[PDB]
Amino acid sequence: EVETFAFQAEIAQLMSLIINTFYSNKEIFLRELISNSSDALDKIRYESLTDPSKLDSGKELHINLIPNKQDRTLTIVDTGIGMTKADLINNLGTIAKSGTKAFMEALQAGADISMIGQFGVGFYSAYLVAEKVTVITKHNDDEQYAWESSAGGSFTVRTDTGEPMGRGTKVILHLKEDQTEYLEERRIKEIVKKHSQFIGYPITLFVEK
């Protein structure tokens, strides 16, 4: 059972802009997702200070990067607070609408795509390198869901039947054919050392067979 939804018009405009603008400095997407994961870890960590049972679904707070050359996917896993079904359908886009509009006003003023993080909507930079994004998420107060979009105006939400995660979020980037450099260990390491040396959680690169 799968539900299909339309993006808000401003978000569909930002995604189509990100997929179509010729922009070579695509590596910033990794910085943005790691920073998002760090935020999600901060929130679960803070909540657990007054309620330790919030960590019953997982005490480790970390970020894994999992390239896969065979499936041409790069997965960013974190054990943060995760997202409810209402987050996936409404709440995230509600908070993002203001940063989307402001970010597009800047782009018409000549501003750079790499400044997307300052408006709180850096996750859509995933579409610089991904033709399709799958988000597997589990929040303490909801069931495990799978969000997916290939842009084009619509996304899907469904209950996830795969491996239970406990708590956290899995961002799976189905990379475009010409963006496989982000599946290489030394390229990922160069980006992480450069863009996210100052994250307060362990970042583990999973290297392949």
Ligand X SMILES: O=C1CNC(=S)N1CCc1ccccc1
Instruction: Quote the CA–CA distance of 173 and 98 in Å, as a whole number.
Output: 25
Q: Is 78 annotated as a binding residue?
A: yes
Q: Which is nearer to ligand X, 120 or 166 (CB)?
A: 120
Residue 155 C-alpha from the chain's centroid:
14
Q: Is 51 annotated as a binding residue?
A: no
Smallest gap from residue 195 Cβ to ligand X (A): 16
Smallest gap from residue 83 Cβ to ligand X (A): 6
Q: Which is nearer to ligand X, 80 or 93 (CB)?
A: 93
Q: How many CA atoms lie within 13 A of 128 on its CB side?
A: 21
Q: Which is nearer to ligand X, 14 or 203 (CB)?
A: 14
Site residues, ligand X (CB under 6 A): 11, 88, 92-93, 123-124, 126, 133, 135, 147, 171
Smallest gap from residue 14 Cβ to ligand X (A): 9
Instruction: Quote the CA–CA distance of 24 and 114 in Å, as a whole number.
Output: 11
Q: Is 25 annotated as a binding residue?
A: no
Instruction: Quote the CA–CA distance of 79 and 44 in Å, as a whole number.
Output: 9
Smallest gap from residue 171 Cβ to ligand X (A): 5
Q: Which is nearer to ligand X, 7 or 140 (CB)?
A: 7
Q: Is 36 annotated as a binding residue?
A: yes
Structural element, H or E, at residue 89: none
The distance in angstroms from the start CA to the end CA of the chain is 35
Instruction: Quote the CA–CA distance of 40 and 43 in Å, as a whole number.
Output: 5
Structure tokens at 59: 């005490």
| Residue ranges at the known binding site | 36, 78, 97, 123
| Residue ranges at the known binding site for ATP | 36, 78, 97, 123
